[PDB]
């Protein structure tokens, strides 16, 4: 799997939505309507169309400066 971060309308989204496509929930943010999810790379496009999903973003990298 790859790790992505999904932004949602919390009132229109349930995290079980992502399990059928091979997704698993890593972390549910308390302060923003988003969830970090591990999913098959082939399923990213699937997430985008799920109820309550507003955006799906890749997990990028920062480095010490």
């Amino acid at each position: 799997t790859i790790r992505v971060i999904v932004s949602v309308d919390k009132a229109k989204f349930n995290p079980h939505e992502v399990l059928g496509i091979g997704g698993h929930i890593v972390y549910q943010f308390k302060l923003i309507p988003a969830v970090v999810v591990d999913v098959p790379a082939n399923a990213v496009g699937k997430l985008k169309k799920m109820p309550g999903v507003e955006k799906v973003e890749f997990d990028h990298q920062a480095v010490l400066l």
Binding site: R3, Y27, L31, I32, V36, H60, Q61, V63
Partner: protein
Amino acid sequence: STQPAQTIPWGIERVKAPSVWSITDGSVSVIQVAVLDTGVDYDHPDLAANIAWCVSTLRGKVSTKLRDCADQNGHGTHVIGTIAALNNDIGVVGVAPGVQIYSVRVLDARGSGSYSDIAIGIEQAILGPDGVADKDGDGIIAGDPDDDAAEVISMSLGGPADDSYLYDMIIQAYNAGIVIVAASGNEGAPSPSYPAAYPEVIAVGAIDSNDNIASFSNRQPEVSAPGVDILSTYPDDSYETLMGTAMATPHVSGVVALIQAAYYQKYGKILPVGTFDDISKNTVRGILHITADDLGPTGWDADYGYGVVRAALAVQAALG
């Protein structure tokens, strides 16, 4: 090994911190500075007393275990020491040598970090140890003595990507009243890396001991500070000299900690964060800009930003 006798690193002197300590060393109860980095050598004799919370967010799992929150790189220990090394008989001394630190480990032993982990780290700095942003529901988070949120988030790290969930978290921090400080980057680029590049975040460039901008410092920062030949704490219970916009960043965060501590001590409130354009004494960022030592060409410039931060003058502006 016997600890060395205390010295004041050149950068602490440059940012005019020592004269502030008679007013405050940052040890005002409600003030905490969250340092999102590689962790901390939490038992370091020149840091331990100021380590108020030690947590990790690596791999998307929040852990408060010492084993998980400890520094496996050294960078976080160094950054934290620039902010908050104790004023005592050993080692070095931080800009704000009495400020409480939250060490939030978002970078691994290699000094690499996922944006997801960093966003979790910012969330943790807002929530604090109690897991709740705003316990009493008043909208006051930073500066609320009933809450345990940090007042400063310091990010000596950067990446090229601008993600909306990350920005959303940055926005939550800003609205909590938290001053966010981040390294501009070390690629000699025309503009800061993320999250420094966000409007709500103070981008920090690096100067050397001759007051020249470091060649590596990403341009168009908001302010600048000591970032070359910077002696600080390092594992294990030792000291090291480093360069980078990561070393400049803590000097600024330390100045902010002094401003907010002094302001709270006097008034029982904190100052608003402010904006990049602010040139008043009514916000933290306004004060930073107006009191900075305007190096290079007159005014804001692409190398120094508004200039080199000066804690003494900033604190006077805050209390004036």
